[PDB]
Amino acid sequence: AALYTHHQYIAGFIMCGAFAHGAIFFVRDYDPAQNRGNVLARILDHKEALISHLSWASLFLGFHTLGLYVHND
Amino acid sequence: KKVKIVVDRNPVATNFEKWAKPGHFSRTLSKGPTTTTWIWNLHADAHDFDTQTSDLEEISRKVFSAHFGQLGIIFIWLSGMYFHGARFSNYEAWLTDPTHIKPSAQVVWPIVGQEILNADVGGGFQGLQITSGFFQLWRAAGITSELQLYTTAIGALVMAAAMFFAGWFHYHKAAPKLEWFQNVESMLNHHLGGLLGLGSLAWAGHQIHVSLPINKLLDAGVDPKEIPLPHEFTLNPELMAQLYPSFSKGLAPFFTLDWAQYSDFLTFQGGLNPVTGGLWLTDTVHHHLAIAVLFLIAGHQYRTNWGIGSSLKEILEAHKGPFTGEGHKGLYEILTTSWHAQLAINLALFGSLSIIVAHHMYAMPPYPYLATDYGTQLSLFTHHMWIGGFCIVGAGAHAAIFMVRDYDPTNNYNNLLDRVLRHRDAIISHLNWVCIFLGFHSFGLYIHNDTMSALGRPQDMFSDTAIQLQPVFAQWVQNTHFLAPGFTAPNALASTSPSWGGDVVAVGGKVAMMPISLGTADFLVHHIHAFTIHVTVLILLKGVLYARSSRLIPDKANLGFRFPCDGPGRGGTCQVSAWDHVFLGLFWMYNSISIVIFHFSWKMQSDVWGTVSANGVSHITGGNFAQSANTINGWLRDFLWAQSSQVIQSYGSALSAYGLIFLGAHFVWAFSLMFLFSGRGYWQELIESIVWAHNKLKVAPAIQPRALSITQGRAVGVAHYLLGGIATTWSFFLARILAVG
Amino acid sequence: KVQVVQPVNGDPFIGMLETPVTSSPAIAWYLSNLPAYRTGVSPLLRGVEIGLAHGYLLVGPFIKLGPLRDVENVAEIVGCINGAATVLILTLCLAYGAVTFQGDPLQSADGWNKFTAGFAVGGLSGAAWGYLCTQILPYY
Amino acid sequence: AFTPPTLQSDTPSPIFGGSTGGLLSQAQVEEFHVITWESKKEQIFEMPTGGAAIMRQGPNLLKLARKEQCLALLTQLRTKFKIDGYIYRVFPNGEVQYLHPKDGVYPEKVNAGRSGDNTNMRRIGQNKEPVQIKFSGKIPAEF
Amino acid sequence: WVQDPLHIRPIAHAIWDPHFGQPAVEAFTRGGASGPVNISTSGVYQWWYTIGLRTNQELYTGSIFLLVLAALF
Amino acid sequence: GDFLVHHAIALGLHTTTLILVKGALDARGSKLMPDKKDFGYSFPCDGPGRGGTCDISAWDAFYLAVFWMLNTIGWVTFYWHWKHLGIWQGNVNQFNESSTYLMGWLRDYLWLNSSQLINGYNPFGMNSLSVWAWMFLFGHLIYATGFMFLISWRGYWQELIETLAWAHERTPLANLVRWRDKPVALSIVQARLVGLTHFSVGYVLTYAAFLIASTSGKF
Numbered sequence A: 001a002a003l004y005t006h007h008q009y010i011a012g013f014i015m016c017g018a019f020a021h022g023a024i025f026f027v028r029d030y031d032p033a034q035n036r037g038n039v040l041a042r043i044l045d046h047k048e049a050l051i052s053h054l055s056w057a058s059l060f061l062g063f064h065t066l067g068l069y070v071h072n073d
Numbered sequence B: 001k002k003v004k005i006v007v008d009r010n011p012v013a014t015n016f017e018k019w020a021k022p023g024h025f026s027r028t029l030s031k032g033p034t035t036t037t038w039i040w041n042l043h044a045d046a047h048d049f050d051t052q053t054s055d056l057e058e059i060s061r062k063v064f065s066a067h068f069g070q071l072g073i074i075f076i077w078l079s080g081m082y083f084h085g086a087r088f089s090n091y092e093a094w095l096t097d098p099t100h101i102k103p104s105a106q107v108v109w110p111i112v113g114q115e116i117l118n119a120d121v122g123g124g125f126q127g128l129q130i131t132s133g134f135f136q137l138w139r140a141a142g143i144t145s146e147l148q149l150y151t152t153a154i155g156a157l158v159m160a161a162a163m164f165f166a167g168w169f170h171y172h173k174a175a176p177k178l179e180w181f182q183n184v185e186s187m188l189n190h191h192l193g194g195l196l197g198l199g200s201l202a203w204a205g206h207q208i209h210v211s212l213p214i215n216k217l218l219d220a221g222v223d224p225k226e227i228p229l230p231h232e233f234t235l236n237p238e239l240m241a242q243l244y245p246s247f248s249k250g251l252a253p254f255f256t257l258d259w260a261q262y263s264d265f266l267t268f269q270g271g272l273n274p275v276t277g278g279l280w281l282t283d284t285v286h287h288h289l290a291i292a293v294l295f296l297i298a299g300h301q302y303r304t305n306w307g308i309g310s311s312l313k314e315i316l317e318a319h320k321g322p323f324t325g326e327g328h329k330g331l332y333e334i335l336t337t338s339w340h341a342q343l344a345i346n347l348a349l350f351g352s353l354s355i356i357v358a359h360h361m362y363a364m365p366p367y368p369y370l371a372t373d374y375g376t377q378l379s380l381f382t383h384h385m386w387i388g389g390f391c392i393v394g395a396g397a398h399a400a401i402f403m404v405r406d407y408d409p410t411n412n413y414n415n416l417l418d419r420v421l422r423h424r425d426a427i428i429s430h431l432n433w434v435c436i437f438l439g440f441h442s443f444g445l446y447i448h449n450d451t452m453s454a455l456g457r458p459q460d461m462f463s464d465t466a467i468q469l470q471p472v473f474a475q476w477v478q479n480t481h482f483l484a485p486g487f488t489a490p491n492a493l494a495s496t497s498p499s500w501g502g503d504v505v506a507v508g509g510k511v512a513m514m515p516i517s518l519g520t521a522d523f524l525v526h527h528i529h530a531f532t533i534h535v536t537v538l539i540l541l542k543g544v545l546y547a548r549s550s551r552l553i554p555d556k557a558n559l560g561f562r563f564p565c566d567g568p569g570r571g572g573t574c575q576v577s578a579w580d581h582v583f584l585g586l587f588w589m590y591n592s593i594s595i596v597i598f599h600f601s602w603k604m605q606s607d608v609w610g611t612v613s614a615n616g617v618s619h620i621t622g623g624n625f626a627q628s629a630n631t632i633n634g635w636l637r638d639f640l641w642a643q644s645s646q647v648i649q650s651y652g653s654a655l656s657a658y659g660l661i662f663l664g665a666h667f668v669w670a671f672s673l674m675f676l677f678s679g680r681g682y683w684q685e686l687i688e689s690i691v692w693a694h695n696k697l698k699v700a701p702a703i704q705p706r707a708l709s710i711t712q713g714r715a716v717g718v719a720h721y722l723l724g725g726i727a728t729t730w731s732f733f734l735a736r737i738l739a740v741g
Numbered sequence C: 001k002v003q004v005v006q007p008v009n010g011d012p013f014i015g016m017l018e019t020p021v022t023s024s025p026a027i028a029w030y031l032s033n034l035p036a037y038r039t040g041v042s043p044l045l046r047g048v049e050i051g052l053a054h055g056y057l058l059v060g061p062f063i064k065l066g067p068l069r070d071v072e073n074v075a076e077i078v079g080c081i082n083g084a085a086t087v088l089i090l091t092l093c094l095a096y097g098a099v100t101f102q103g104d105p106l107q108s109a110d111g112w113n114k115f116t117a118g119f120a121v122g123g124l125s126g127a128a129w130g131y132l133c134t135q136i137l138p139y140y
Numbered sequence D: 001a002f003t004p005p006t007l008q009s010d011t012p013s014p015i016f017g018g019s020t021g022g023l024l025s026q027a028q029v030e031e032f033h034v035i036t037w038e039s040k041k042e043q044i045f046e047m048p049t050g051g052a053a054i055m056r057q058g059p060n061l062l063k064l065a066r067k068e069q070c071l072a073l074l075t076q077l078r079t080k081f082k083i084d085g086y087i088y089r090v091f092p093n094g095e096v097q098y099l100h101p102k103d104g105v106y107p108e109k110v111n112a113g114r115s116g117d118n119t120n121m122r123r124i125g126q127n128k129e130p131v132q133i134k135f136s137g138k139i140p141a142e143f
Numbered sequence E: 001w002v003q004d005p006l007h008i009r010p011i012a013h014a015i016w017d018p019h020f021g022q023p024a025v026e027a028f029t030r031g032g033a034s035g036p037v038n039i040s041t042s043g044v045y046q047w048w049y050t051i052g053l054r055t056n057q058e059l060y061t062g063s064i065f066l067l068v069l070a071a072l073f
Numbered sequence F: 001g002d003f004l005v006h007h008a009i010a011l012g013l014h015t016t017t018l019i020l021v022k023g024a025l026d027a028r029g030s031k032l033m034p035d036k037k038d039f040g041y042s043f044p045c046d047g048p049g050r051g052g053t054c055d056i057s058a059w060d061a062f063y064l065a066v067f068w069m070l071n072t073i074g075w076v077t078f079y080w081h082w083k084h085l086g087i088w089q090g091n092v093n094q095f096n097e098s099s100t101y102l103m104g105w106l107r108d109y110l111w112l113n114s115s116q117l118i119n120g121y122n123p124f125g126m127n128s129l130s131v132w133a134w135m136f137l138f139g140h141l142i143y144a145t146g147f148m149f150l151i152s153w154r155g156y157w158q159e160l161i162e163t164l165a166w167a168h169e170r171t172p173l174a175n176l177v178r179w180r181d182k183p184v185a186l187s188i189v190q191a192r193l194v195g196l197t198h199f200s201v202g203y204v205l206t207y208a209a210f211l212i213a214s215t216s217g218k219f
């Protein structure tokens, strides 16, 4: 139990750090002129689709998992 | 000059045009909802009558009619209570055997298996077990029939209609002028004499003629269906004479000043009735007669349309001394022109009164068979404690509001308000030192106990087994109160409460009230109470004092009472307003009252409540408060883990609902954190992405979804936090006390 | 009519008022006659007096409440504890002096350095005299 | 041309009973501020440090700690009294600056002869990219 | 622990704390050690046992080698 | 029960990723702050204008996502621990029937397994599990402290500290000691960091104490 929980918490923190440093890359080291038309620019182009679909997936999962738990309860 | 009645005829026309158009009262709210913030501000500013009109006359009229509406709502509520007692309650069955039938007054329907909630309370009945103490109240009144509850409910409905009609009439047909409202001397004369005074006198008359013979016969022990109806006792002094012989002499002793002859129903006894566990109704009769006379005397002080009397202004202006400059000069003008000043005073005094009520009702149960009803005890105490705390925080909020809006420095020059505002840093500095010192010497004591217990050095921790901290002053006061009857209370036959000392009052095999001992744990919890109270008063007092200005933001009152911040400048000015001070004071009041009710619950379940086994009292928890309350682990294990066993194991029973709310409240509280840790910007950009998704499918609203304002985010967060916490404690208390006790 | 609360120095725009606690002649005399508020006296001697008072004051808590209070040998353990407390507060004084005085003759680099030395030899002395008072006092 | 007025040290102060929000140790080591105005009647006003003072007929002087307190007091005067005042900055060595009515004309009215400091002639997104200015000891909005 | 891997609680390090009472010193003497000790929940005993380390001299040799290696880095 | 818990895990991963991805992409500028890259990765806000811009920087997205990471890993470890605690005792039925509703989690897991942990020290003595009981309460204290920084914000504290500064500069026998650094309340972003650090440390310590004392106690 100790080893599993230890490595799981370590992994969670490291994932948060990976995303934090991706954000820092975008704020600091991202050059639109060099990265023009590549997959990085293209994924910045339609960010609203990504954010809205993450929002839908999370809303669905939360609504339904909570609803089933509450119904059973 | 000369107090009189002044009204305007038909000031307002009774139409429905303004209901069709929301937001009519406020100029800013008008011109359509461009964004949802309009929808929120429509409700947030509905009763803020100050921002709808600057005329104090119109503000006062709106307040008058709103009070009538509130009275109508309260009468609807009372009518509902009495009607449910009349129809869906086992009151008539509970009267015969009040010791074994569990009070109930709400049945549920069959619709989705919720029928299980119908408890097997008793009397051949099934329903939810009420804890509002209405059965004991009705028995103390002397009801003993379900027709009388129906009559009372219908009368309360008629009176609710009367209240609503009165509100409509006094806003739309005959509305008072402003100079009517400002007759504070006449209003005080009528609220001392007419309201409280004549009300107490009328209640004493009722008890003498209804509640006293009926309850005498019930306490002697009679099936209620044979007892004469109250009008029979009232109308002939023969029956009362057989019960209370002094009624054979009539009113002649009263007008002859031979009042001692009324000693058989105007007693001074104290203590509890051994058969019911409540105060003697003769004692309460005498109490109400006495205070009715005292209030009638009090209601003649102030001057009105005749020369005799004192003036509030003259009395206030004459109390000035060397340390205060002008003293109370200008207090009269800032009390009869600002409603928020009166609201602060009245809310503070009302919350303190509610808390006093809670105390005086657990210690000295005033209704028959109410001490033995442990659920009613706990519920009534906790309810009045929470109501008092909320009212006190409201007093703080409205003191701040008055300090922001209705305070002008022209009339408040070198008077008491000016003197206080002119040295606020000293007050706040010293109050913060007191909070620090109390926090250390209250919580660090618990932490020292915890550390010594975990280290295996119980000879070092503060406890009765080691370093003692004994409440010498509280114990001395308890002893002094015990020694009163016959010494300093020569005409009192027994102590006012069996909590000072003496014997154990037990009713129906259940303890009603036994002496409460104070030791080291009681010392520690009382200092915890002092610490929490002091931090709460610090927050609210600092908000009131620095409402206007601050060395950080001198023009704060220009930003209003309720504003989020003042930019990230000066290092950050988040939550600098008075409203945010109220927002934090709510959290601290919650903490304070929660610790108070935890202390009451554990102390009563460990040192008072229990069953008498013909050889000693066997308390519910067995006395573990005296030895386990000294440590935080003791509270987490011997009170919160241990006593939660009745709520988490409630599934499939009648208390199953308390098992759901206990969980459900845990949700709401946690949900509140969403609003308290987050900020508006994240939500605005998230909503921007959501709105793009809607735009792509032509379903965007024409009303802009806007994230909640900063102030509203904080308000929603605190509302949810308080709701979740209070509901958790309420369900836990109720399930615990309805499964044991 | 008795005006007890006035602004300090008669100037109402300084963050003080003179009050029957701040300016009453008894309190003013008592504080001015305290060793700290004596600019004229040599800083070493004022440190000596302060250390004497504070070292002697500081013994009692550990004597009556230390971990080894119930054992008879508590007096000497506590004398050691108070010597250590005075020593630590001494290095506090040195850090403060070496920080605040780097760019009342007490408020100077050499004035404080001597005052820190005077606090030493007097501070340990009260921790020593406190031990002797435990072994010599009749009443104790 | 314009000539800022001279700070007359011997000026009556408002009738004030003493406050706990007045000057502190910062006014003896750094610097403090002085505000001077001229009252057409002796009237009660609200001093930004809590409490109420009475301003006297004629010239009045009042010294505070922060500049912003002085400007808050001056805004109160301009709105509720229509009184125009002057804010000087006093150093503890004796030096005196003249602050708020810098050109005699208030900051909201064009004076024609003022310096256009810190006025970029580009929009808000026309600034440089942080990657281009990396390791420069500045921010994108000052190039 | 090598002899009885299933009936021995692996010891982490010794406890030296001058605040302990006598009962705590009694309660923390566990896996056969002479004084109070901590029981390891890191699973390093199993790892070192599996990879070939059997005696304490080998553990000490590894510690010395790794100390020198850290100095070299 | 495994179905329900795996979907809870899916909710956690998706919401944490939503916060992190949104803060990473919405970091060069939003509709609310079109020039956010001019301010850097971390900054407090953009004043109370335009409705209010609290927690607007990308650093605040990381801040808000750390809570969700903690919650999600807590769900994962709760699931693993209860599944295997049923496994190791041979009583698979307790989980398999009690894990389909939340009161089963609250009662048959948190409440039941906490009996030995909270009994580590008590008025009748202590055992080896006293250190874990103390650590349990210690983590509770740290987490509860972190709420102070998370809920209260710089503005009450600045005025309070400043009144304290008046008190210290102005009291006899203490005017002889002055601060070299002017005491100011923690900054906004710093306070968010402090509250988050307390939250995480308390979370980790509390769960570690519960896990070690609930597994080593029974086995």
Ligand code: CLA
Binding pocket: A013, A014, A015, A016, A017, A018, A020, A024, F041, F042, F059, F062, F197, F201
């Ligand atoms: C290989 C791993 C790695 C590396 C090399 C870096 C490197 C860097 N990071 Mg980063 N980061 C990482 C992982 C990593 N990170 C992870 C896993 C996370 C998720 C938590 C983050 C989240 C993160 C953020 C949000 C930020 C950085 C920033 C930075 C830069 C400056 C760091 C700094 O400010 O120092 C300062 C170090 C500290 C202030 C330490 C704080 C104290 C810690 C967090 C808690 C202490 C409590 C303690 C453990 C309690 C004791 C326990 C006991 C009491 C029980 C730097 C280049 C900053 C940056 O780039 O600026 C734009 C920035 O803001 N990182």
Ligand code: CLA
Binding pocket: A055, A058, A059, A060, A061, A062, A063, A064, A066, B667, B670, B671, B672, B673, B674, B675, B677, B678, B686, F011, F015, F018, F019, F064, F065, F067
């Ligand atoms: C128990 C606490 C709690 C709960 C329930 C939530 C729930 C949620 N969070 Mg949240 N969060 C929390 C704590 C919590 N959080 C904390 C402490 C933080 C740190 C500040 C965050 C930070 C955070 C961020 C940054 C984000 C979320 C998001 C979300 C949403 C994710 C979508 C979803 O799961 O849909 C499921 C929906 C629900 C579970 C809500 C339940 C539905 C209700 C109960 C039904 C209504 C019934 C009834 C009509 C209620 C009204 C009755 C009353 C008026 C009388 C969701 C609503 C994300 C989001 O915004 O989504 C897009 C988002 O990005 N959270």
Ligand code: CLA
Binding pocket: B012, B013, B014, B015, B016, B017, B018, B019, B025, B061, B062, B063, B065, B066, B068, B069, B070, B073, B164, B165, B166, B167, B168, B171
């Ligand atoms: C049916 C009779 C009637 C009619 C037609 C009107 C009509 C009008 N009144 Mg009114 N009034 C009435 C009765 C009536 N009143 C009564 C009985 C009272 C005594 C309380 C008042 C007191 C009163 C005041 C103080 C004011 C008005 C005002 C007005 C005007 C606009 C304000 C308005 O009501 O907007 C819309 C109001 C509503 C759509 C309904 C109000 C919400 C109700 C009261 C909720 C009741 C509480 C309820 C229990 C909800 C709480 C809990 C809930 C969750 C269950 C409008 C022309 C205002 C005015 O003069 O113009 C500026 C004004 O301020 N009235």
Ligand code: CLA
Binding pocket: B063, B064, B067, B068, B071, B180, B181, B183, B184, B186, B187, B190, B191, B193, B194, B195
């Ligand atoms: C004997 C005289 C008398 C009595 C009994 C009352 C009683 C009351 N007044 Mg009142 N008042 C009086 C004189 C009186 N007043 C005078 C002379 C003035 C002029 C200054 C005022 C001005 C005044 C104001 C401005 C307000 C009150 C309010 C109230 C109510 C307090 C709220 C409450 O819940 O209390 C306890 C509730 C009860 C005891 C229930 C009893 C209800 C009955 C029906 C009372 C009706 C008696 C009525 C005052 C007598 C004349 C009515 C008749 C003309 C039809 C209360 C019912 C407040 C209020 O609630 O607004 C309505 C309020 O805002 N009064």
Ligand code: CLA
Binding pocket: B043, B044, B045, B046, B047, B048, B049, B347, B390, B391, B392, B393, B394, B395, B397, B401, B561, B562, B579, B582, B586, B719, B723
């Ligand atoms: C006699 C008591 C009393 C009265 C008459 C007032 C009157 C007033 N208050 Mg006030 N207040 C009080 C007590 C009182 N307060 C108390 C006890 C507190 C402490 C909590 C406060 C704290 C307070 C604050 C902080 C503020 C006011 C404000 C106001 C003014 C506007 C109120 C408004 O319209 O908001 C609109 C009404 C609502 C938004 C209704 C929602 C209120 C909460 C969310 C309801 C809680 C839910 C409920 C318990 C049910 C929960 C169950 C759920 C599942 C449905 C108004 C004149 C505001 C002001 O600006 O003053 C000028 C202001 O900001 N009050």
Ligand code: CLA
Binding pocket: B432, B435, B436, B437, B438, B439, B440, B443, B444, B447, B535, B538, B539, B584, B587, B588, F141, F143, F144, F145, F146, F147, F148, F151, F152, F156, F160
């Ligand atoms: C468990 C969480 C927690 C804790 C420990 C505190 C603690 C404190 N709060 Mg706080 N608060 C909290 C939650 C918490 N709060 C939350 C969630 C909120 C949001 C509503 C607030 C909002 C709030 C406000 C608005 C205010 C406070 C204030 C205070 C301080 C009051 C002084 C005192 O209590 O005396 C003493 C301090 C303690 C008893 C803390 C425990 C320390 C132990 C017992 C002793 C210390 C010795 C230590 C163990 C040895 C050092 C070890 C070494 C390694 C360093 C205090 C430090 C008030 C303040 O600033 O001062 C008046 C203030 O006004 N709080």
Ligand SMILES: CC1=C(/C=C/C(C)=C/C=C/C(C)=C/C=C/C=C(C)/C=C/C=C(C)/C=C/C2=C(C)CCCC2(C)C)C(C)(C)CCC1
Binding pocket: A018, A019, A021, A022, A023, A025, A026, F021, F024
């Ligand atoms: C079935 C199976 C298989 C397959 C598998 C697969 C298919 C896999 C995978 C995988 C995956 C799929 C993985 C992943 C993960 C991911 C992650 C983990 C993420 C991430 C990202 C990030 C973190 C980002 C960052 C950033 C930002 C944010 C910005 C920009 C850019 C950067 C990068 C900087 C096999 C046959 C082999 C085996 C058996 C089973």
Ligand code: SF4
Binding pocket: B564, B565, B566, B567, B568, B569, B572, B573, B574, B575, B679, B710, F044, F045, F046, F047, F048, F049, F052, F053, F054, F055, F188
């Ligand atoms: S974070 Fe919010 S409350 Fe704080 S300064 Fe910025 S806008 Fe104002």
